[PDB]
Design a protein around this nucleic acid. Sequence first.
DNA 1: GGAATCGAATCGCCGC
RNA 2: GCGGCGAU
DNA 3: TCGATTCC
Length: 856
Amino acid sequence: MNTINIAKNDFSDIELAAIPFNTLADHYGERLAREQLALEHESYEMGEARFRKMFERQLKAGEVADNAAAKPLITTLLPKMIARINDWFEEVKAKRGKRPTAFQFLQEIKPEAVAYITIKTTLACLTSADNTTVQAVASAIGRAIEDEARFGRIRDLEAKHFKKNVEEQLNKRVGHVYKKAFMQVVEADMLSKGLLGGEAWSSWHKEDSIHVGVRCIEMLIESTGMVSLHRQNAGVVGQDSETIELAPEYAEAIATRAGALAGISPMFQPCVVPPKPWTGITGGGYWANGRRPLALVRTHSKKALMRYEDVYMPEVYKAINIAQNTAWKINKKVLAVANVITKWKHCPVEDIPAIEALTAWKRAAAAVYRKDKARKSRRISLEFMLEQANKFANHKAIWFPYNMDWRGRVYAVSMFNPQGNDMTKGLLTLAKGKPIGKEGYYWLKIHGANCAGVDKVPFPERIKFIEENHENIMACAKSPLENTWWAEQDSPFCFLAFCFEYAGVQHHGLSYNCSLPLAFDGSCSGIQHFSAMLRDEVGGRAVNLLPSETVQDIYGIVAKKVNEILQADAINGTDNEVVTVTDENTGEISEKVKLGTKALAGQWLAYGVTRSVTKRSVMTLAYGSKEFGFRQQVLEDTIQPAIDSGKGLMFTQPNQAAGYMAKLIWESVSVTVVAAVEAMNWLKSAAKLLAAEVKDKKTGEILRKRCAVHWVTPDGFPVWQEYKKPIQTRLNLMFLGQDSEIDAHKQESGIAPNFVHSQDGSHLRKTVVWAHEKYGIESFALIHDSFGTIPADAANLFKAVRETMVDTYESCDVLADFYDQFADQLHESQLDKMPALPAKGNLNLRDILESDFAFA
DNA sequence: GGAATCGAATCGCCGC
RNA sequence: GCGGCGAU
DNA sequence: TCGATTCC
Ligand SMILES: [Mg+2]
């Protein structure tokens, strides 16, 4: 109810504190200091308002218990409630005679769960309905206990395998009513199949539900210090009542956590001065001594950060500080267009005017449900991104602080940042421009080609596309509202950003001062890095590591290989077979048709396999996907949209064709990028052996403990992969879920994506240092595997990003160094089981320097 | 040991 | 944690 | 499905 406004003293500190004002005015003067510290003061003020609205929305809907300010008392109140749940259960079982009316209802539910539900529904009722009456409150337990007892029967006993199917569609429902409707329809379906044992739920009558709840107030008073009973007008049977007795003592305890957590969530804005350079682990970026100091590495534990406190990494610190020094400004011309069309369209480039059936309906019904969520989810940030773009639009320059994740990828810290979407990327441009010149004009035109989606042809055709559309770009730049052509492109606002700079070179010639960031994007960075480590010529050429006759499309290379076997499987290959198969649930044994590869191939050839069929499987390979994961991709990306849109008449049995294509895609991808597949296998074996508590069964003692996986990037950034799992969790059907060990599978399921993402972070960090010290490059646009600068320095960043990768993998065998880190950490019995280093192929890294389409 | 079973990237914002 | 969006 | 991991 009452929240401490924490802004009075500590939010007044950051402006009025001496030392933060001292070191910042010494660099940029007092007046930039007074604005920067007031802007950081504002950022905390917009964030305390962010909490209080969310807290006030939670109390309106009765959602006060799932905040992290109500958690730390709740996590210490359940261990006493469970005892008094048992203690009442142990008081009457020894007494002979009848049960008290509610004893039987309390037993069907897990004694930890009933502890929770009596807590939350009482705070839900009092903070929303303002009524202390037991008739509303004792029913609040009793209705929701009956909800969890009846519908948790599905999750508990008769459908533990079938719940895993219906769990996802229950999660996609939002709100207690919608999850209740779905759980009602599910239960009625199973009783038609006779799944839950055939007994339909006999609903508790009203007088039962109140009796269930008047229990759970009484065990709360004896168990915990929360709520102490109060009796009203005793002796008058007309006026005999008892308050809910919710303790104001504990309401203060959530307020000292509501107020404390409201000061630690700031809405991070950009910087009007260059951000404070990183000299240590905390403190910089933003200049003030705030309640939330920026961390150099965004770790999930404070211990994980403290290992970084002493490690000597001069080149990591150099690379972040150079990146922070890039002066950005808001593209005023792009913002003028964006300020107009967003007032008319929810997404300004969305709908431009231009020239077994029950499960298909249910798929279409869920489509508008998700798109209604999607439309609300995309418009609220677009309004915010426009506000932040409009706020700093008149500033001569703004700056973005930078820190890193726990693997070493570089992230801008402000919520408005160059790392956002196309509109935000188009709304931002560099401030320190140069005369564009001949080379800058050429690379500006190339940057224009990639904004329009023309990135699959060589540079002369990319140059040619811009020149043929000269009158289209000029008419778009002269008036962007009379010509929608820029909005039709792949990157619309960034293309319009190119359109104005192209117009400036047309008006002012090659002496035009241009500061547009010209991005260069690595094709598939993980596969690019994996092929470079093991020197795969065939894999490297597929992601343009090598000079090729044209741009190489790794999605279409796989699709060509799939269509090769598809036409081979149309001539030879298995015929259709009849196989006996049983559904495990009904037990019924049926004799269905299993299509041979001959009939399966002719189905796919009727559909037509292009790079759209195999795109997602290649993209998710570096994330760990393999032949099984491709099957649900093929069914979701290709097969089901075909059936819904009139095609799929070939796909008589969709799950058979999805697993057939997944077999073919994996056969093609794992044979095209060989070094990628082998490298993730080696890393997975390493994290598997490191994360075992390997012990002898007879002695029972662990010879070697669970061990985390750790490596060092060639830049000098160290990484610690330590996924940790909790001991016990509780899951409620209608309501929300409530020491540690090493989560061994997450260690295996993360080692190869995190390592190659750590590798492209060191590649990025070495690139911005090499471009800034060997060349004069001072402005940087950095999206993980994307490299951007002003057009005059574009040719050097083009040359520098190739130089660092060539030098790094020539100077560092990052796989063999990774072996040297963990090898002394192995148990004997695992040492024989560790596979050897994957071999080195015939690729020469010096070819990368002349690779036109690596971009990185 | 042996079924019984489980499982098949990071980061941000918003909402429950 | 779950639902949705965006970035790689 | 194919392998690990997990309770037993
Ligand atoms: Mg594209």
